[PDB]
Every structure is written in structure tokens, then in C-alpha cells.
Design an enzyme around this catalytic site. Structure first.
Site, PDB file in Angstrom:
ATOM      1  N   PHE A 183      26.463 -28.948  19.556  1.00  0.00           N
ATOM      2  CA  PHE A 183      25.680 -27.735  19.443  1.00  0.00           C
ATOM      3  C   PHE A 183      25.474 -27.088  17.964  1.00  0.00           C
ATOM      4  CE2 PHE A 183      23.746 -23.666  20.185  1.00  0.00           C
ATOM      5  CZ  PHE A 183      22.884 -23.697  20.942  1.00  0.00           C
ATOM      6  N   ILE A 238      22.955 -24.834  15.104  1.00  0.00           N
ATOM      7  CA  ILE A 238      21.809 -24.246  14.724  1.00  0.00           C
ATOM      8  C   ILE A 238      21.604 -24.341  13.207  1.00  0.00           C
ATOM      9  CG2 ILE A 238      20.659 -21.947  14.609  1.00  0.00           C
ATOM     10  CD1 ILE A 238      20.396 -23.549  17.388  1.00  0.00           C
ATOM     11  N   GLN A 287      20.079 -18.809  11.671  1.00  0.00           N
ATOM     12  CA  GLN A 287      21.191 -18.193  12.234  1.00  0.00           C
ATOM     13  C   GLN A 287      21.322 -16.717  11.980  1.00  0.00           C
ATOM     14  OE1 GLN A 287      24.670 -21.331  12.574  1.00  0.00           O
ATOM     15  NE2 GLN A 287      24.839 -20.460  10.408  1.00  0.00           N
ATOM     16  N   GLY A 300      19.257 -14.977  17.004  1.00  0.00           N
ATOM     17  CA  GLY A 300      19.205 -15.034  18.423  1.00  0.00           C
ATOM     18  C   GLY A 300      18.828 -16.621  18.822  1.00  0.00           C
ATOM     19  N   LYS A 311      21.980 -18.309  20.972  1.00  0.00           N
ATOM     20  CA  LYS A 311      22.091 -18.072  22.387  1.00  0.00           C
ATOM     21  C   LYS A 311      20.934 -18.180  23.349  1.00  0.00           C
ATOM     22  CE  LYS A 311      23.589 -13.639  22.519  1.00  0.00           C
ATOM     23  NZ  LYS A 311      23.576 -12.278  22.546  1.00  0.00           N
ATOM     24  N   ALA A 323      31.655 -18.648  18.087  1.00  0.00           N
ATOM     25  CA  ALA A 323      31.045 -19.545  19.149  1.00  0.00           C
ATOM     26  C   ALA A 323      31.480 -19.002  20.286  1.00  0.00           C
ATOM     27  CB  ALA A 323      31.500 -20.933  18.783  1.00  0.00           C
ATOM     28  N   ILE A 324      32.928 -18.597  20.571  1.00  0.00           N
ATOM     29  CA  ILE A 324      33.486 -18.315  21.692  1.00  0.00           C
ATOM     30  C   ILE A 324      32.775 -17.085  21.969  1.00  0.00           C
ATOM     31  CG2 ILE A 324      35.473 -17.448  22.585  1.00  0.00           C
ATOM     32  CD1 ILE A 324      37.126 -19.018  20.730  1.00  0.00           C
ATOM     33  N   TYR A 332      29.488 -18.201  23.799  1.00  0.00           N
ATOM     34  CA  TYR A 332      29.791 -18.673  25.259  1.00  0.00           C
ATOM     35  C   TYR A 332      30.191 -17.962  26.313  1.00  0.00           C
ATOM     36  CZ  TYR A 332      29.212 -22.894  22.067  1.00  0.00           C
ATOM     37  OH  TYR A 332      28.701 -23.727  21.268  1.00  0.00           O
TER      38      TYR A 332
END
Ligand SMILES: [Cl-]
Ligand SMILES: [Cl-]
Ligand SMILES: [Cl-]
Ligand SMILES: [Cl-]
Ligand SMILES: [Cl-]
Ligand SMILES: [Cl-]
Ligand SMILES: [Cl-]
Ligand SMILES: [Cl-]
Ligand SMILES: [Cl-]
Ligand SMILES: [Cl-]
Ligand SMILES: [Cl-]
Ligand SMILES: [K+]
Ligand code: NA
Ligand code: NA
Ligand code: NA
Lengths: 147, 146
Positions: free
Chosen positions: A76, A78, A83, A86, A89, A119-120, A123
Site C-alpha cells: 500500500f 501513496i 501525501q 488524506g 486513509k 502507518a500504524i 491503520y
């Protein structure tokens, strides 16, 4: 002088390999992506997708149902030009919904490196939680459950 | 307006995806590499190796002999810290010799993007030649016959 040799990747060096610095090799990452795409095209379990905002390609994702029947978000990305605005997400949420519509299950899986805080957080905001599993690459597994 | 949608990767957009500007994202690379290792470890055709100069990790390779019977150089990276010091040629040459020993073949294959000038040069200098084939990703295949 040079002492060039090669080592199988193990727990002893996997994280060093994962942290290989390559943050200017623009031509190299072209080759990385071409191979990414080739590897997805090779097996029907895997599927690659371009992520678009209208006609503008803004990113990329790979995913698929692994043999255990678990559905994974495997890659995944972008594009840097887009970046902080938004897209990640928004795109990640939509991808999640598409996956649970495509497949029977209501659970999605991914694994992250223990320092990828950017990233965490993304998610986590989208409902992924650490489930106490480790992936084959030593990464910590996260799991989204729908209900 | 935000209009997010997903398209399958075909020849129409593959090269657009291959050119995604993600070359400055450090953490993204860690995940990319981790996924490389996961996929490599999954299939027995494929093997991943760290490239070392003595005790220093300097790069990464991935290679495999697929069901078709051809032996490929799938991924090859030199850490940007140790670029421009001849590690590319020496390591790739040594890797080539490893693979023709490990397998029965006297041929090795790779594919390259057209605008990749350094790679085509490097591989040509080591003995690879364009064989007129296209890979599944639209890249031009190069071949080294020992
Ligand atoms: Cl060796
Ligand atoms: Cl190491
Ligand atoms: Cl953002
Ligand atoms: Cl969590
Ligand atoms: Cl945990
Ligand atoms: Cl869509
Ligand atoms: Cl196509
Ligand atoms: Cl980063
Ligand atoms: Cl590569
Ligand atoms: Cl080099
Ligand atoms: Cl040639
Ligand atoms: K690569
Ligand atoms: Na992962
Ligand atoms: Na393997
Ligand atoms: Na290639």
C-alpha cells in the site's frame, strides 16, 4: 580489498535487509515496482491495483486471499506528490470495504515494521489492532474485524 | 472534489504505476522490502539473499528458476551508501556465477525498464543482451548465455 559474499535471509539479517537504504534510486524503484507487478501477475491469489483520484494515479496497492483463506493487504503506497492530504486513509478505507465485499470473510490482515509509526497510526484509526501474531518476515500482524 | 477509485493494472497504466514517485519514502521502503522477503520466502522457486562486503550488508538480491525452466535475476539493489564504488558489477558477476552453478542452465534472464540507462549498461558490460522478448510487465528481456 572487497570480500563479496551472499547470505540467505534469516532472523539474523532480515531486519538489516529490510532497512537497506535506497532513498534516491529512482530507477531502482521503477525496477522494484515492475517486479512487484510481475509477481502479482504470476499468481491468481494476488492482485495489484492503481489508486486514482479522478484521472490522476496517486498510489498503488497489492492484496489477495492467501491459502489459509485470510485476506491480506500486502502492499500500500501513496505517491509522494500527494501525501499528507488524506489520500492514504481515504483510499485505505475504500480498499478495506471492497475486500470484505469481494470475499466472504469480515476480517482483513496486514503486518507492519515495529517502527513505522506513520502507518500504524493510519491503520489504528481505521480499526486495525495488533492481534499478537508475527508474520513470516518477523513483522507484527494487525487485524481489522468488521462486526 | 475527491474521487478515489481503483483500477486493475494493465498495459494502459502499468508504466504509470511503475513510475509512482515513492523513491523518497524511507518507511515505505522498509515495508516494501519486508513484503519482498515474505513473498520470496513463500515460494521455493524464489530465493532472497543479502549482499555483503565482509561483515557489511551492502545490498539485496532475489532470484529464481520458475516452472518455465528459466533462471531469473528478479531483484538487485545496492545500498545508496555504497553506490559508485564497483559493488554493482562485482556482486552481480559473482551472483551470475553462483546461479549457473546452482542450476543446470548456462543462461540467465532479467528484464529492464527502457529509461534505465545504468542498468542496461551494467548488464551489457557483464554479458547480458536484449533477446527481443517482452516480460509480463512489458519490460525488455535481457539474456546472458555462458
Ligand atoms: Cl557467496
Ligand atoms: Cl547484517
Ligand atoms: Cl495524509
Ligand atoms: Cl493497536
Ligand atoms: Cl500484541
Ligand atoms: Cl473503485
Ligand atoms: Cl494488459
Ligand atoms: Cl519515512
Ligand atoms: Cl530490483
Ligand atoms: Cl553500484
Ligand atoms: Cl544487447
Ligand atoms: K527490488
Ligand atoms: Na507486512
Ligand atoms: Na523461497
Ligand atoms: Na525486470
Amino acid at each position: 580489498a572487497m570480500e563479496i559474499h551472499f547470505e540467505k535471509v534469516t532472523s539474523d539479517n532480515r531486519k538489516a535487509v529490510e532497512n537497506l537504504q535506497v532513498f534516491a534510486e529512482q530507477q531502482a524503484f521503477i525496477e522494484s515496482m515492475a517486479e512487484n507487478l510481475k509477481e502479482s501477475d504470476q499468481f491468481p491469489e494476488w492482485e495489484s491495483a492503481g489508486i486514482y483520484d479522478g484521472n490522476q494515479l496517486i498510489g498503488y496497492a497489492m492484496y489477495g486471499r492467501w491459502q489459509d483463506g485470510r485476506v491480506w493487504l500486502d502492499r500500500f503506497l501513496i505517491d509522494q506528490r500527494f501525501q499528507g492530504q488524506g489520500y492514504g486513509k481515504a483510499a485505505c478505507r475504500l480498499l478495506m470495504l471492497k475486500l470484505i465485499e469481494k470475499y466472504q470473510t469480515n476480517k482483513l490482515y496486514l503486518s507492519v515494521y515495529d517502527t513505522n509509526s506513520s502507518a500504524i497510526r493510519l491503520y489504528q484509526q481505521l480499526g486495525f489492532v495488533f492481534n499478537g501474531e508475527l508474520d513470516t518476515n518477523g513483522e507484527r500482524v494487525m487485524e481489522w474485524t468488521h462486526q
